[PDB]
Design a protein around this ligand. Structure first.
Ligand SMILES: [Mg+2]
Ligand SMILES: [Mg+2]
Length: 263
């Protein structure tokens, strides 16, 4: 019997491939960039937060699977009303999200023992990266910026995935430390007070502002130690924010970079 999975979030998609079940995926979202060579060859269903039932359903799924980032809620009710099985998992901002999503997905795909194996492997890489973070004796102050050209310019504080990543890697989230919760508009006051040692951004956000030169035209950013030293870390969003099987690898990368910033 044929199995036709539609996955609604990139991290969920990454888990499906990592569990060795990628051949059954018929549709993915825009954020599904890993493994790049395999996902870019698959039909897109749109933006994970801006979904239509028509988009999902006309791929003729046997199963629709995602996490709490998938929406809107009303589209999700349309899937269930069509009688297509729908499995939505929680995705909390914590280092426990990867293992929880892995087990949920493996169970939803009837391969729970495979999910225990991958979850353990991922756990091990997370633990190994956190140990590498013990190299840092002087935690750098890090500011995460969420950028979309001039339309969106935001900082991330507490109760986010990126906050967890910054801390686990041995950095201080400078925005969080100043009391910012979730995503808030970036102000010159916040940046200047924070004096971040390093600016953390997304690949596509950094391109969208016109590279490093564009980024440093945002008011307040140039007058920070990060701005003066051009100390910018850019990661793709799925890798940094997704909390998927590669979390331990992103942490290793971040902590290596945070150590350089600490020097
Ligand atoms: Mg401060
Ligand atoms: Mg997610």
């Amino acid at each position: 019997g044929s199995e036709r999975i539609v996955s609604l979030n990139g991290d969920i998609t990454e888990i499906i491939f990592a569990l060795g079940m990628g051949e059954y995926v018929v549709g993915v979202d825009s954020s599904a960039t890993y493994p790049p060579e395999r996902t870019k060859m698959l039909p897109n269903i749109g933006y994970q937060r801006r979904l239509s039932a028509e988009g999902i359903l006309s791929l003729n799924p046997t199963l629709v699977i995602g996490d709490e980032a998938a929406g809107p809620p009303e589209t999700l009710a349309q899937i269930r009303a069509a009688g297509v099985p729908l499995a939505i998992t929680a995705d909390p901002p914590s280092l426990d999200a990867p293992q929880q999503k892995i087990r949920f997905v493996a169970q939803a795909l009837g391969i729970p023992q495979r999910g225990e194996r991958l979850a353990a492997q991922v756990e091990a890489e997370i633990a190994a990266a956190r140990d590498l973070a013990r190299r840092i004796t002087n935690p750098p102050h890090v500011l995460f910026l969420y950028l979309r050209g001039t339309d969106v310019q935001q900082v991330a504080g507490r109760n986010t995935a990126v906050d967890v990543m910054i801390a686990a890697a041995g950095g201080i989230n400078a925005a969080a430390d100043a009391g910012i919760v979730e995503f808030k508009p970036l102000s010159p006051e916040v940046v200047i007070a924070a004096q971040p040692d390093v600016l953390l951004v997304l690949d596509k956000g950094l391109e969208s502002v016109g590279g490093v030169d564009g980024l440093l035209k945002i008011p307040g950013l140039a007058d920070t130690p990060a701005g003066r030293q051009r100390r910018i870390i850019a990661l793709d969003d799925l890798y940094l924010l997704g909390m998927g099987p590669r979390t331990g690898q992103a942490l290793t990368d971040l902590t290596i970079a945070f150590y350089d910033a600490a020097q």
